[PDB]
UniProtKB/Swiss-Prot annotation, chains A, B:
It comes from Homo sapiens. Its main location: cytoplasm. The keyword Lyase does not apply. This is Polyribonucleotide nucleotidyltransferase 1, mitochondrial. It catalyses: RNA(n+1) + phosphate = RNA(n) + a ribonucleoside 5'-diphosphate. The modification N6-succinyllysine is found at K509. The gene is PNPT1. RNA-binding protein implicated in numerous RNA metabolic processes. Catalyzes the phosphorolysis of single-stranded polyribonucleotides processively in the 3'-to-5' direction. Mitochondrial intermembrane factor with RNA-processing exoribonulease activity. Component of the mitochondrial degradosome (mtEXO) complex, that degrades 3' overhang double-stranded RNA with a 3'-to-5' directionality in an ATP-dependent manner. Involved in the degradation of non-coding mitochondrial transcripts (MT-ncRNA) and tRNA-like molecules.
Length: 710, 710, 102
């Protein structure tokens, strides 16, 4: 019956074990205030067929996030919301690096919101619960880890703020740390604040995570556990690594020394060397798993790359530690687009499109779907696309692609603090990668800032983003970082063989978003501060380059900019205009794409993406309040039309069955309003001659006349 | 050309074949009254890659049963509604046991509703059509089977009733009889009916299914189809079985005879013996399929388990045939939940949560997708969750597992009869299994009964559910049943090795739900009656235990429970408050979770999950609709209002964030006719005495005016 | 196939009708030319249901068999097949689905 209480300033965290799902390898329950979340972790024993960590983590959304109840194709959830994906990705990036290397077994972690009071957020509870469950199970781990959230309100740091304080907070930061004050997960979003407060918040967060770790360590020592022994660790044998190094170090050094190489050429050369070395190894040791050979080669390559970076300060192209690739920016690519931006840094190249849309477009039909998806505070949201062909790869274009969603959320959080408070239309920023060479999220946010800058949306201090990489040479005994180097504007290979990824974006004088992905098992805060400083310098340079192209937003939107207007509809014609159940409007809404709403019984708001579409819709409205339905009728021309229907105010006459019946009205039948058209020889099935005269818009009648024939 | 008519009291079943879908292995058409359904069965001729019966049955649908057309994802019923899932599960549990053992070939059975009239339901017709198609095709079988549905109206057992009958019946039973009067599949839902009536209904149904069996036999004799011979049956060799038995019977008896074992330890010992036995077999017959070895070992284990059960009357852990494992119940686990219950029957443990919700939540956005499923006449519905960690397993959490959906439907039918007639809120009973050891469906039903018992829902006679297993020593010479034993509250292993499974739920006097799937090719009625008696005794005992911890539900639900309030919004500001196209309302809803409905042009209904949520919502509308949210009080009470902002001709005053900040005029505010109210001292926060004239359409809000005050 | 059948049947529908029209076709035995068969059967079904149409709609399939010369990639001899069977389609060179009126 493990149970412990941890005090954080004002909040109390109750961590409990047992009593709930004892069959799982690790079960934990974290309770804060009145809400509580239960986390389970289960790992198999048979080694996975795949040669890598098949770790999966899931965060099941529940009802009381706002007091609503979630309904989907599963009546609770199919797919996820953005929030679930973000929380799952946070938990993954927080717990994965602590796992021992070479551990290749299925491992699934679930977290369920047992009960939500709507006062305390459950995600920061979920991370701690996952840490407890892992540390308390037989699964090997190097944890435990402790996660806290820091907000800033009225110049004061608050640990684990409530939702009410969340709304008014100018900063929302999530810090997950390791024992001995090692940071493992940083995720922050602030409203363009200075870096000094950022450093202070980071220090406070790590200080509190130390207390959390103290408490959980006390619990695990109290209850006592015994980590299971994995049947096999998939680490490469030291002898194979030694032979691979002695066989390929010179060639790898040679191919990494020259600075005339794109991604493709360098990858091809290293792949050829890999083929030769793999053949040599298979000849030398025809008794080992081929994956072991591949892993040995990869380890040798990573070691060589890290060594050359550490000892020569030229990463792979002659760039120093603090530099960046060439940057090119283009705006206004196509007239028909509200805003176009093309941002190309080095090999990486992305395109961002800004398209306006009606406010009502941001709300779905049913309440439940809107609630689960939520509504952005500012009427603005950004979509991020990563098609496979951007990396010369073939893959399923559709689906979810959680990495795409995470990158989109990151970029949207980066761009958020500069969107103006209100706008007549919803901002729909769309960015997609075209040539992917790493740091695509920062480039996408940068290009989106450029596109918004072009579309005339009044913003301030166009945002710029940058990535930071870290290379460490550490002792094998204590794991202490003996030496470290920082890299600015990393490449794909730099990230792949690096130790951590640090994507940070901000304005000319503040930081907006931060998402530090670290693969090492924890790093000291000093490295983080150095990264922040270098990133600030790089951001200044990038902003200089951008402002060299475009600085102030355009005075007005493009002539193709959407227009919102009002239309007056009399009550008498109101029913005819709206149609049964508003069907006509829907049809019109689906015909030209304009959006029609009503403000009162008479005024109607009309939103149109293009002025031409607006004028067309206005003509359609004028027609609707007028008369219509004419087909193949001429003035003074005899038409051999066969009558089909009999009605008081006219006859539905068709020239032939393949023609919409037109109203031959009695009022134009001998110029006398009758309820019996047959008085003028209007007999169904008779090949009469019908002559058109005009129209009656207000009366809603046709001027068809058989009187000329009769 | 097969055509045969079968008479059931007053209904005619026309079975036809050879006219449509002649390409399929077996095609049948069943016509009752004017509803016709065609069923096709196709089986491959190659052994499946898997090593088990890969039966797949699908029951398509046309939504014309209510007259509408299915348009969930396409203009058909591609959405796989819950009713379709239940029907498919019924078909599977009705036809699977009749297949010969070891038949491992892909086999798919599809049902298409050729024509429905809303008078005769097609499901039972679908079962009969599947039976006919299988019996008439070359696929080996031991049928045919005959399915009927029995209803009770005014003490009369009607057979195959019409929809109006289903509406008026107190019982709905479905029987899948087999030749020589054997029951294969039983599925019944009654509105808390007695026991002997249930027995009589079972007898009538099994008597009636003989006629349809006779008809199908006549048809198949007329056509004279010849079954194909399978290329290879996958039953283990008898001699290998003999060797495995002689090798492992001692150890298996030793492990199964002790009474100190959870599920995990017993499974571990079984697997431990399995490894050595497999090694011995490999050393003995290094020429057989390894899966044959696995099957031989499993057969030996099942045989010895059944033998020990039959001969010693002690199943496991010292429990006799009738006694059931321990049960513990807890209520009110968390304050914020509307109702919480925790049930722990032996090793199985399930948590049940009940949360209220608005009636409008039970209706989807459009109409067509709403009609794909019912509306649950007694406003109530159950959600069932079977996460993989409940059984220490790994699996996808999303994808609509048919087993979990069927179990949830069974629990919902079990709990339906005791729900009160009407209730101001929809009831959502969520049950998630945590420790899974079999019979989790009845445990979930009991937990939901407890949760309702706790949330103050005025229900009667808390429902209890139990499971029953059967172990028989059949004679392969005649296929008869020589000795049988009935087990109460089976474990997972007992179900796995048992001949069948029975689930019975009911009140202190009656029976509500009854699902009985049998893995044997039919069983006599006597066994069913014995199972009914045993389940009745067990239900009495379980209710006796349950009532100790809770009874006579709480007079009122928890104060955190939802509240419903009336609101008055006169027209002039009704237009503003609703906003363009109601957008404002939606903007409120997803941002606070409150639900707003328009009672009429003047009144609105407000539904809030918590009183705190209601206060938050009214304050949000206070701060977001340019005015304040409004609450209904007695008209004609002099109050005092604080000033939010100062106007030249008036004020924007309000009393609390629960009545609209009302614009006042000089004739209403300033009796001194001064352009500056600040002369009187009117400032932000200053109280002014106002008269509550009530909500009037002239202003669009409550008429707050000081005609004689100040 | 559904879109092809729908476009085939489109020009024989009156400009207006009091109700939406849903033409659902299900295949039961496939031996090629299923789309034209579905369209023609839908023509019959609409014809029966009472909704007026300009005329009946008939669909057909055409196959082609060519003895090409690989040395030049030319068409030496060709033969046309009416109402192509499934095997002919599978081993043929092309498929032609065409529908119309009288």
């Amino acid at each position: 019956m493990g149970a412990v209480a941890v005090d954080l300033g004002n909040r109390k965290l109750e961590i409990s074990s047992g009593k709930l799902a004892r069959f799982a390898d690790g079960s934990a329950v974290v309770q804060s205030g009145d809400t509580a979340v239960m986390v389970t972790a289960v790992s198999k024993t048979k080694p996975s067929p795949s040669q890598f960590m098949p770790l999966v983590v899931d965060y099941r959304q529940k009802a009381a996030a706002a007091g609503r109840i979630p309904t989907n194709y599963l009546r609770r959830e199919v797919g996820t919301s953005d929030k679930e994906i973000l929380t799952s990705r946070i938990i993954d990036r927080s717990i994965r690096p602590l796992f021992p290397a070479g551990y290749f077994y299925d491992t699934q972690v679930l977290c369920n919101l047992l009960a939500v009071d709507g006062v305390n957020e459950p995600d920061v509870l979920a991370i701690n619960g996952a840490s407890v469950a892992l540390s308390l199970s037989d699964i090997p781990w190097n944890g435990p880890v402790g996660a806290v959230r820091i907000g800033i309100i009225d110049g004061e740091y608050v640990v684990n703020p409530t939702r009410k304080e969340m709304s008014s907070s100018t900063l929302n930061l999530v810090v997950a740390g390791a024992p001995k004050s090692q940071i493992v997960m940083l995720e922050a979003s602030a409203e363009n604040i200075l870096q000094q407060d950022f450093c202070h918040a980071i220090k406070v967060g790590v200080k509190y995570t130390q207390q959390i770790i103290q408490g959980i360590q006390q619990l695990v020592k109290e209850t006592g556990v015994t980590k299971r022994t994995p049947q096999k660790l998939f680490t490469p044998s030291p002898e194979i690594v030694k032979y691979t190094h002695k066989l390929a170090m010179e060639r790898l050094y040679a191919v990494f020394t020259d600075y005339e190489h794109d991604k493709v050429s360098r990858d091809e050369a290293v792949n050829k060397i890999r083929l030769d070395t793999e053949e040599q190894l298979k000849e030398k040791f025809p008794e080992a798993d081929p994956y072991e050979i591949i892993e040995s080669f990869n380890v040798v390559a990573k070691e060589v790359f890290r060594s050359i970076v550490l000892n020569e300060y030229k990463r792979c192209d002659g760039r120093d530690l603090t530099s960046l690739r060439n940057v090119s920016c283009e705006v206004d690519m196509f007239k028909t687009l509200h805003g176009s931006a093309l941002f190309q840094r080095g090999q990486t190249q992305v395109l961002c499109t800004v398209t306006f849309d009606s406010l009502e477009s941001g709300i779905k039909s049913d309440q439940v779907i809107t609630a689960i998806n939520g509504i952005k505070d500012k009427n603005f949201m950004l979509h991020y696309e990563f098609p496979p062909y951007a990396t010369n790869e073939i893959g399923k274009v559709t689906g979810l692609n959680r990495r795409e969603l995470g990158h989109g959320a990151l970029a949207e959080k980066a761009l958020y603090p500069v969107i103006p408070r209100d706008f007549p239309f919803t901002i729909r920023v769309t960015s997609e990668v075209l040539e992917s060479n790493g740091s695509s999220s920062m480039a996408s946010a940068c290009g989106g800032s450029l596109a918004l800058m072009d579309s005339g949306v009044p913003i301030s201090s166009a945002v710029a983003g940058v990535a930071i990489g870290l290379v460490t040479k550490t002792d094998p005994e204590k794991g202490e970082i003996e030496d470290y180097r920082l890299l600015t504007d990393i490449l794909g290979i730099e990230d792949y063989n690096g130790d951590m990824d640090f994507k940070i974006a901000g304005t000319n004088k503040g930081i907006t978003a931060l998402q530090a992905d670290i693969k090492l098992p924890g790093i000291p805060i000093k490295i983080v501060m150095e990264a922040i400083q270098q990133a600030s310098v790089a951001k200044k340079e990038i902003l200089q380059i951008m402002n060299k192209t475009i600085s102030k937003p355009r005075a007005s939107r493009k002539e193709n900019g959407p227009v919102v207007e009002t239309v007056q509809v009399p009550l008498s014609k109101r029913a005819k205009f709206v149609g049964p159940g508003g069907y006509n409007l829907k049809k019109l809404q689906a015909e030209t794409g304009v959006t029609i709403s009503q403000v009162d019984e008479e005024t109607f708001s009309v939103f149109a993406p293009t002025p031409s579409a607006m004028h067309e819709a206005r003509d359609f409205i004028t027609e609707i309040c007028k008369d219509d339905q004419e087909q193949q009728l001429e003035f003074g021309a005899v038409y051999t039309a066969t009558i089909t229907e009999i009605r008081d105010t006219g006859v539905m006459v068709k020239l032939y069955p393949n023609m919409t019946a037109v109203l031959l009205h009695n009022t134009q039948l001998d110029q006398r309003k009758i309820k019996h058209p047959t008085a003028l020889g209007l007999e169904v099935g008779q090949e009469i001659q019908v002559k058109y005269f005009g129209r009656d818009p207000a009366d809603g009648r046709m001027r068809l006349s058989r009187k000329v024939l009769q």
